[PDB]
A paper describes a structure:
The tremelimumab epitope of CTLA-4 consists of several discontinuous segments. The tremelimumab residues involved in the interaction with CTLA-4 are heavyW52, heavyY53, heavyN57 and heavyY59 of HCDR2; heavyR101, heavyG102, heavyA103, heavyT104, heavyL105, heavyY106, heavyY107, heavyY108 and heavyY110 of HCDR3; lightQ27, lightS28, lightN30 and lightY32 of LCDR1; and lightY91, lightY92, lightS93 and lightT94 of LCDR3. As observed in the structure of free CTLA-4 and that of CTLA-4 in complex with B7-1/2, the three consecutive proline residues of the MYPPPYY (residues 99–105) sequence of the FG loop of CTLA-4 in complex with tremelimumab adopt an unusual cis-trans-cis conformation and participate in interactions with the antibody.
In summary, the elucidation of the crystal structures of the checkpoint molecules PD-1, PD-L1 and CTLA-4 in complex with the Fab fragments of therapeutic antibodies sheds light on the molecular mechanisms underlying the therapeutic activity of these monoclonal antibodies. Blockade of the ligand-receptor interaction of these immune checkpoint molecules can directly enhance the function of T-cells, which represents a critical paradigm shift whereby checkpoint blockade aims at disinhibition of the activity of T-cells compared with the previous immuno-oncology concept, whereby cancer vaccines and cytokine therapies aimed at de novo activation of immune responses. Monoclonal antibodies blocking immune checkpoints have demonstrated unprecedented therapeutic benefits in clinical trials and provided a major breakthrough in oncology.
Author numbering:
A (entry chain Y): 1 to 119
B (entry chain H): 1 to 225
C (entry chain L): 1 to 213
């Protein structure tokens, strides 16, 4: 089967505006370069929340004052997003792309609905 | 009024090189992935290459790997395709097309939503040649139930295209102008036919108007019994 | 690479028909599939993306479904503007391969061709070459066989065919076949015949002429 990217269906941000979720994926070959992108979908519009490239055998790292922080044990990432406000409520999609060596592969996550309230 | 305009196409000798350009206007070019796709005469679509919005990554069809290079200059709203070591089988219309790649409207919106008009690349050693225009005379063996067939054979020209009209455009119904064929000589040939009332021969004059612009060639041929 | 296949190669339909065509990938591509429409002389147009989402401005009679390896495009009620060729394309993994396309053409009753033959003109003959042209006019369906015979000998490797796009007024096709010979070869023989096979004919029809008669 094709690359599969899975993430929880719903996450609630803490009262401090911090939300965490795992993005885990089943990869085809041995890519040496992987792009991980977090997109927010709402209101027929999409924006990039954060993105990072990882290479070698390193942990996905977001650089530098990003609102996103990550880990990674193999082909998965625990993402943490800070500074969220009520207006940031929406669908957060993890996109994973195998970039190098070719061929390219695309993996789009099912999406995590993040709910945020202003304390 | 999104626009993609290709240029650079033409005749090129086998083994040689060509650069195609695709100029964009009416949208944020630097936000879109761009592709080249080609289509050989009478054949289906074949994907050639893609380049990321910021030029950071590119991928290629296995048939062009090692010979073609895709690039872009976002400061000039322009996409390029450098084609080296060209072969007869690279003959095709080349299209450029944009792709939002999930960066607008929806995160899953991937697809070539706007295409250029195409530019034609003809890989051949042939030299420019105007056509010979021969009559296809109506007769006993081209008449049927009060209708007669007649036409013009437009033979041995290069490159494409030629255009054909009958009686300076006055005669249009019953006209069939066929797609050119490429002969083993490397020159093109086609025919144009029209069926007319068998009555009309000898009283109505029929003339095929043939035009080959790359030759600067204009021909009128009266076709008679 | 990922091989995309499409069925059928061609289908004949009428206005108002529900039409469904299929696309298959040689390995799973999840839902990462586009459908395109193309008409002769024109650039392709995106119809469907992510297997089932409708491109803006595309009529709602168009729908798509599938995920994994098998996909369908459906037109709930075929309209005159929908007669075209349809291509699928995967974008899961590079190269981003197209299917071979499915042509949707207009259905009509079977019509045998009107068959005409044209000897070479004397003008062409004066420069050393002879073209014989056989015309198959206004027939349906498109499939036809044209065999050249010279003094009853089957010809091979010296003829080429051309076929028009389906006519929009009467839904027919026409076909031209051209036999090319040296002048010397043309004069060494007498009887030039075009033999035609087609669904509309109960047995092959021969149109012929005798050189110099």
């Amino acid at each position: 089967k094709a690359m599969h990217v899975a993430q929880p269906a719903v996450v609630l941000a803490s009262s401090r505006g911090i939300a965490s979720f795992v993005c885990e994926y089943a990869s085809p070959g041995k890519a040496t370069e992987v792009r991980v992108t977090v997109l927010r979908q709402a209101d027929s519009q999409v924006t990039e929340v954060c993105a990072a490239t990882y290479m070698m055998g390193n942990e996905l790292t977001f650089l530098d004052d990003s609102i996103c922080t990550g880990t990674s044990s193999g082909n998965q990432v625990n993402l943490t997003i800070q500074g969220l406000r009520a207006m940031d409520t929406g669908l957060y999609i993890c996109k994973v792309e195998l970039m190098y060596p070719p061929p390219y592969y695309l993996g789009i996550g099912n999406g995590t609905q993040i709910y945020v309230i202003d304390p | 009024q999104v626009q993609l305009v290709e240029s650079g196409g033409g005749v090129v000798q086998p083994g040689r090189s060509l650069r195609l350009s695709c100029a964009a206007s009416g949208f944020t070019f630097s936000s879109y992935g761009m592709h080249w796709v080609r289509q050989a005469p009478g054949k289906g679509l074949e994907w050639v290459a893609v380049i990321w919005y910021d030029g950071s990554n590119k991928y290629y069809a296995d048939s062009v790997k090692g010979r073609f290079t895709i690039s872009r200059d976002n400061s000039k709203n322009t996409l390029y395709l450098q084609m080296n070591s060209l072969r007869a089988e690279d003959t095709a219309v080349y299209y450029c097309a944009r792709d939002p790649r999930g960066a607008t409207l929806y995160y899953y919106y991937y697809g070539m939503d706007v295409w250029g008009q195409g530019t034609t690349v003809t890989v051949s050693s042939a030299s420019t040649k105007g056509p010979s225009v021969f009559p296809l005379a109506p007769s006993s063996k081209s008449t049927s139930g009060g209708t007669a067939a007649l036409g013009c054979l437009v033979k041995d020209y290069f490159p494409e295209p030629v255009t054909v009209s009958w009686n300076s455009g006055a005669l249009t119904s019953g006209v069939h102008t066929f797609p050119a064929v490429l002969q083993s000589s490397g020159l093109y040939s086609l025919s144009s036919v029209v069926t007319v009332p068998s009555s009309s021969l000898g009283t109505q004059t029929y003339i095929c108007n043939v035009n080959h612009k790359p030759s600067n060639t204009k021909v009128d041929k009266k076709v008679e019994p | 690479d990922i091989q995309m296949t499409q069925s059928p190669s061609s289908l004949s339909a009428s206005v108002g028909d529900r039409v469904t065509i299929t696309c298959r990938a040689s390995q799973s591509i999840n839902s990462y599939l586009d459908w395109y429409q193309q008409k002769p002389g024109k650039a392709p147009k995106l119809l469907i993306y992510a297997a089932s989402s409708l491109q803006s401005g595309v009529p709602s009679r168009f729908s798509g479904s599938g995920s994994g390896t098998d996909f369908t495009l459906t037109i709930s009620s075929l309209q005159p503007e929908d007669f075209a060729t349809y291509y699928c394309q995967q974008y899961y993994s590079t190269p981003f391969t197209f299917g071979p396309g499915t042509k949707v053409e207009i259905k009509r009753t079977v019509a045998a061709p009107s068959v005409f033959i044209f000897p070479p003109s004397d003008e062409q003959l004066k420069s050393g070459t002879a073209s014989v042209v056989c015309l198959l006019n206004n027939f349906y369906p498109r499939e036809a066989k044209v065999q050249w015979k010279v003094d009853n000998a089957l010809q091979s490797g010296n003829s080429q065919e051309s076929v028009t796009e389906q006519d929009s007024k009467d839904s027919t096709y026409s076909l031209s076949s051209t036999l090319t010979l040296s002048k010397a070869d043309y004069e060494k023989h007498k009887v030039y015949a075009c033999e035609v096979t087609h669904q509309g004919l109960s047995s092959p029809v021969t149109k012929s002429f005798n050189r110099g008669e």
